[PDB]
CSV table of C-alpha atoms and ligand atoms in Angstrom, one decimal:
chain,number,residue,atom,x,y,z
A,2,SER,CA,24.9,5.9,-16.9
A,3,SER,CA,24.8,2.5,-15.6
A,4,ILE,CA,27.4,3.2,-12.8
A,5,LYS,CA,25.6,5.8,-12.2
A,6,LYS,CA,22.2,4.7,-11.1
A,7,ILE,CA,23.7,1.4,-9.6
A,8,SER,CA,25.6,3.3,-6.9
A,9,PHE,CA,22.0,5.5,-6.7
A,10,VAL,CA,20.2,2.0,-5.9
A,11,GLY,CA,23.3,1.6,-3.9
A,12,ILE,CA,23.3,4.7,-1.4
A,13,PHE,CA,19.8,4.8,-1.7
A,14,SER,CA,19.3,1.5,-0.9
A,15,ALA,CA,21.8,1.7,2.3
A,16,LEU,CA,20.2,5.1,3.5
A,17,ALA,CA,17.1,3.7,3.9
A,18,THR,CA,18.5,0.5,5.9
A,19,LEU,CA,19.9,3.5,8.5
A,20,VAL,CA,16.5,4.9,9.0
A,21,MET,CA,15.1,1.7,10.2
A,22,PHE,CA,17.0,2.2,13.2
A,23,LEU,CA,14.8,5.1,14.2
A,24,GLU,CA,11.9,2.7,14.4
A,25,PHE,CA,9.0,3.4,17.3
A,26,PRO,CA,6.0,1.0,18.2
A,27,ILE,CA,3.8,3.9,18.0
A,28,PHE,CA,0.8,1.9,19.4
A,29,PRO,CA,1.5,0.6,23.2
A,30,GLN,CA,-0.6,-1.6,22.1
A,31,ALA,CA,0.5,-3.7,19.0
A,32,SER,CA,4.1,-2.5,20.0
A,33,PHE,CA,5.5,-4.9,18.0
A,34,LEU,CA,4.7,-3.1,14.5
A,35,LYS,CA,6.9,-0.7,14.2
A,36,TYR,CA,7.2,2.6,11.7
A,37,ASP,CA,9.9,3.3,10.2
A,38,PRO,CA,10.0,6.1,6.9
A,39,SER,CA,13.1,3.6,4.9
A,40,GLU,CA,10.3,2.7,2.7
A,41,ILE,CA,10.5,6.6,1.3
A,42,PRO,CA,14.2,5.5,-0.7
A,43,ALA,CA,12.7,3.0,-2.1
A,44,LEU,CA,9.3,4.8,-3.4
A,45,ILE,CA,11.5,7.3,-4.7
A,46,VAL,CA,13.8,4.9,-7.1
A,47,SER,CA,11.1,2.6,-7.3
A,48,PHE,CA,9.4,6.1,-9.5
A,49,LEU,CA,12.8,7.2,-11.2
A,50,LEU,CA,14.2,3.3,-12.4
A,51,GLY,CA,10.8,1.5,-12.2
A,52,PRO,CA,8.8,-0.8,-9.9
A,53,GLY,CA,10.9,-3.8,-9.7
A,54,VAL,CA,14.3,-1.7,-9.0
A,55,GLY,CA,12.5,-0.3,-5.8
A,56,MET,CA,11.3,-3.7,-4.8
A,57,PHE,CA,14.9,-4.4,-5.6
A,58,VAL,CA,16.5,-1.8,-2.6
A,59,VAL,CA,13.8,-2.7,0.3
A,60,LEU,CA,14.8,-6.2,-0.5
A,61,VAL,CA,18.4,-6.0,-0.2
A,62,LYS,CA,17.9,-2.8,2.7
A,63,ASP,CA,16.2,-5.5,5.4
A,64,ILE,CA,18.7,-8.1,4.4
A,65,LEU,CA,21.0,-5.3,5.5
A,66,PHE,CA,18.9,-4.9,8.2
A,67,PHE,CA,18.7,-8.4,9.4
A,68,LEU,CA,22.7,-9.1,9.4
A,69,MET,CA,22.9,-6.2,11.8
A,70,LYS,CA,19.4,-6.9,13.5
A,71,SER,CA,19.7,-11.1,13.0
A,72,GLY,CA,17.1,-11.5,16.1
A,73,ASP,CA,13.6,-10.2,13.8
A,74,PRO,CA,13.6,-13.3,10.6
A,75,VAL,CA,9.5,-12.6,10.9
A,76,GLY,CA,9.2,-9.0,11.6
A,77,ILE,CA,11.7,-8.6,8.8
A,78,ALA,CA,10.2,-10.3,6.2
A,79,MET,CA,6.9,-9.4,6.9
A,80,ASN,CA,7.8,-5.7,6.5
A,81,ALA,CA,9.6,-6.5,2.9
A,82,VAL,CA,6.8,-8.8,1.6
A,83,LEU,CA,4.9,-5.9,2.6
A,84,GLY,CA,6.9,-2.8,1.3
A,85,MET,CA,7.9,-4.8,-1.9
A,86,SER,CA,4.5,-5.4,-2.6
A,87,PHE,CA,4.2,-1.1,-1.9
A,88,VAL,CA,6.2,0.6,-4.1
A,89,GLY,CA,6.6,-2.5,-6.1
A,90,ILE,CA,2.7,-2.0,-7.1
A,91,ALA,CA,2.7,2.7,-6.7
A,92,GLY,CA,5.7,2.5,-9.0
A,93,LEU,CA,3.5,0.2,-12.3
A,94,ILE,CA,0.8,3.3,-12.1
A,95,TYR,CA,3.1,5.7,-12.5
A,96,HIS,CA,5.0,3.8,-15.0
A,97,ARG,CA,3.7,3.2,-18.3
A,98,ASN,CA,2.3,6.8,-18.9
A,99,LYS,CA,4.1,8.7,-16.8
A,100,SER,CA,1.1,11.1,-15.4
A,101,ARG,CA,0.9,12.9,-11.9
A,102,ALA,CA,-2.5,11.9,-11.0
A,103,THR,CA,-1.6,8.2,-11.7
A,104,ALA,CA,1.3,9.0,-9.1
A,105,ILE,CA,-1.0,9.7,-6.4
A,106,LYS,CA,-3.9,7.7,-8.0
A,107,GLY,CA,-0.8,5.2,-7.1
A,108,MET,CA,-0.2,5.7,-4.0
A,109,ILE,CA,-3.8,5.8,-2.8
A,110,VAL,CA,-4.0,2.3,-4.0
A,111,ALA,CA,-0.6,0.7,-2.8
A,112,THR,CA,-1.1,2.7,0.9
A,113,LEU,CA,-4.9,0.0,0.9
A,114,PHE,CA,-3.4,-3.2,-1.0
A,115,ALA,CA,-0.5,-3.6,2.1
A,116,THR,CA,-2.9,-2.6,4.6
A,117,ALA,CA,-5.1,-5.0,3.3
A,118,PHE,CA,-2.2,-7.5,2.4
A,119,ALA,CA,-0.9,-7.2,6.1
A,120,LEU,CA,-4.0,-8.1,7.6
A,121,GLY,CA,-4.4,-11.4,5.5
A,122,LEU,CA,-1.0,-12.1,6.5
A,123,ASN,CA,-1.0,-11.2,10.2
A,124,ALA,CA,-4.1,-13.4,10.1
A,125,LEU,CA,-2.3,-16.8,10.4
A,126,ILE,CA,1.1,-14.7,11.4
A,127,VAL,CA,-0.3,-13.4,14.6
A,128,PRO,CA,-1.3,-16.9,16.2
A,129,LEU,CA,1.7,-18.7,14.9
A,130,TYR,CA,4.3,-16.0,16.5
A,131,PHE,CA,2.7,-15.5,19.6
A,132,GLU,CA,1.9,-19.0,19.8
A,133,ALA,CA,-1.7,-18.1,20.8
A,134,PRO,CA,-5.4,-18.8,19.8
A,135,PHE,CA,-6.5,-16.9,16.8
A,136,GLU,CA,-8.9,-14.1,18.7
A,137,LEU,CA,-6.2,-12.7,19.5
A,138,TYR,CA,-4.9,-12.0,16.0
A,139,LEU,CA,-9.1,-10.2,16.2
A,140,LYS,CA,-7.5,-7.8,19.4
A,141,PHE,CA,-5.1,-6.8,17.6
A,142,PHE,CA,-6.9,-6.1,14.0
A,143,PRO,CA,-7.9,-2.8,14.9
A,144,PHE,CA,-3.9,-1.8,15.2
A,145,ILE,CA,-3.3,-3.5,12.5
A,146,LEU,CA,-5.6,-2.3,10.1
A,147,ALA,CA,-4.1,1.7,11.5
A,148,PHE,CA,-0.5,0.9,11.4
A,149,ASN,CA,0.1,0.4,8.3
A,150,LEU,CA,-2.8,2.4,6.9
A,151,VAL,CA,-1.2,5.8,8.8
A,152,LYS,CA,2.4,4.3,7.5
A,153,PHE,CA,2.2,3.5,4.1
A,154,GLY,CA,-0.3,6.7,3.8
A,155,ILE,CA,2.1,9.1,5.4
A,156,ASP,CA,5.4,7.2,3.4
A,157,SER,CA,2.9,8.5,0.3
A,158,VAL,CA,2.2,11.7,0.9
A,159,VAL,CA,6.0,12.7,2.1
A,160,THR,CA,7.7,11.5,-0.9
A,161,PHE,CA,4.8,13.7,-2.8
A,162,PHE,CA,6.1,16.9,-1.1
A,163,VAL,CA,9.0,15.7,-2.5
A,164,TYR,CA,7.9,14.9,-6.0
A,165,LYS,CA,6.2,18.4,-6.3
A,166,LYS,CA,9.0,20.2,-4.5
A,167,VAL,CA,10.9,20.1,-7.7
B,1,RBF,C1,3.9,-10.0,13.9
B,1,RBF,C2,4.1,-8.8,13.3
B,1,RBF,C3,3.5,-7.9,12.3
B,1,RBF,C4,4.4,-6.8,11.6
B,1,RBF,N1,3.3,-6.0,10.7
B,1,RBF,C5,3.4,-5.6,9.8
B,1,RBF,C6,1.8,-4.9,8.6
B,1,RBF,O1,1.4,-5.1,8.9
B,1,RBF,N2,2.5,-3.6,8.4
B,1,RBF,C7,3.9,-3.1,9.1
B,1,RBF,O2,4.1,-2.1,7.9
B,1,RBF,N3,4.8,-3.9,9.6
B,1,RBF,C8,4.0,-4.7,10.1
B,1,RBF,N4,5.2,-5.7,11.1
B,1,RBF,C9,7.1,-5.0,10.5
B,1,RBF,C10,7.7,-4.3,11.8
B,1,RBF,O3,7.7,-2.8,12.5
B,1,RBF,C11,9.2,-4.7,11.3
B,1,RBF,O4,9.2,-6.1,10.8
B,1,RBF,C12,10.4,-4.6,12.1
B,1,RBF,O5,11.3,-5.1,12.1
B,1,RBF,C13,9.7,-5.5,13.6
B,1,RBF,O6,11.0,-6.8,13.7
B,1,RBF,C14,5.2,-6.3,11.4
B,1,RBF,C15,6.1,-7.1,11.9
B,1,RBF,C16,5.9,-8.4,12.8
B,1,RBF,C17,6.4,-9.4,14.0
B,2,BNG,C1,17.4,12.0,-7.2
B,2,BNG,C2,15.8,13.0,-6.7
B,2,BNG,C3,15.0,12.5,-5.4
B,2,BNG,C4,15.1,13.8,-4.5
B,2,BNG,C5,15.9,14.4,-3.4
B,2,BNG,C6,15.3,13.1,-1.7
B,2,BNG,C7,16.3,12.9,-0.7
B,2,BNG,C8,15.8,11.7,0.2
B,2,BNG,C9,13.8,11.9,0.8
B,2,BNG,O1,13.8,12.3,1.4
B,2,BNG,C10,13.7,12.2,2.6
B,2,BNG,O2,14.4,11.0,2.6
B,2,BNG,C11,15.6,11.0,4.3
B,2,BNG,C12,16.0,10.0,4.1
B,2,BNG,O3,16.2,8.3,4.5
B,2,BNG,C13,14.2,10.6,5.8
B,2,BNG,O4,15.2,10.8,6.6
B,2,BNG,C14,13.6,11.4,5.4
B,2,BNG,O5,12.3,11.6,5.9
B,2,BNG,C15,13.2,12.6,3.6
B,2,BNG,O6,12.6,13.3,3.7
B,3,BNG,C1,-13.7,-21.6,19.8
B,3,BNG,C2,-12.6,-23.2,19.9
B,3,BNG,C3,-11.6,-23.2,19.0
B,3,BNG,C4,-11.5,-22.3,17.8
B,3,BNG,C5,-10.8,-21.1,17.8
B,3,BNG,C6,-9.9,-20.9,16.6
B,3,BNG,C7,-8.6,-21.2,16.1
B,3,BNG,C8,-7.6,-20.6,17.2
B,3,BNG,C9,-6.4,-21.9,16.8
B,3,BNG,O1,-5.3,-21.7,17.9
B,3,BNG,C10,-4.3,-22.2,17.8
B,3,BNG,O2,-3.6,-22.7,19.1
B,3,BNG,C11,-2.5,-23.0,18.9
B,3,BNG,C12,-1.9,-22.4,20.6
B,3,BNG,O3,-2.8,-22.2,21.5
B,3,BNG,C13,-2.1,-21.7,18.3
B,3,BNG,O4,-0.6,-22.1,18.4
B,3,BNG,C14,-1.9,-21.7,17.4
B,3,BNG,O5,-1.7,-20.6,16.0
B,3,BNG,C15,-3.6,-22.0,17.0
B,3,BNG,O6,-4.1,-22.0,15.8
């Protein structure tokens, strides 16, 4: 009903901006990697309303979260770029032909893509963010792998329990 779903998007993006405050490192070595469940409202909006909408909410979520945490411009752009890639790919697989089999085929792939996109991103980001040589990224490599694999893997299954609980 247009005005119905636009506020649905509005409050869901605001929901995701709030849970982004419960972020924790989970990895003491790679402390900059912080997990929040703020990609689960996006993954739900992306399934109902479309991939482009799901990437819209993580874009505005982080913009809001950046306006309130105006100090991590690189660590929020990384989150958005990776988050937009996760919900966009997952929404596309479940789109076209709506099916439960594709809904898990998409979350398996979207978890694997975002993880690969993060490693390729941090290869030329971690050296510059810490003003350090490329070997520091190699020290951080298995933690970036396990993190985004677990982060989007958890977001995938937790969204699945909700999608199956109806
Ligand atoms: C150098 C750096 C690397 C990051 N890498 C990832 C990542 O690989 N996967 C991810 O989900 N989030 C990543 N983040 C997301 C991070 O939790 C978010 O941007 C926080 O708000 C950091 O300020 C990264 C952040 C920074 C600063
Ligand atoms: C319109 C139908 C959609 C289904 C209803 C589910 C509502 C939200 C999805 O789950 C929950 O969202 C919270 C807020 O972000 C998270 O804190 C929590 O971890 C997660 O479990
Ligand atoms: C083996 C000898 C040399 C090759 C090492 C591999 C590549 C490392 C590059 O170092 C550079 O150092 C700067 C400051 O130290 C960083 O700001 C910069 O991001 C980084 O690009």
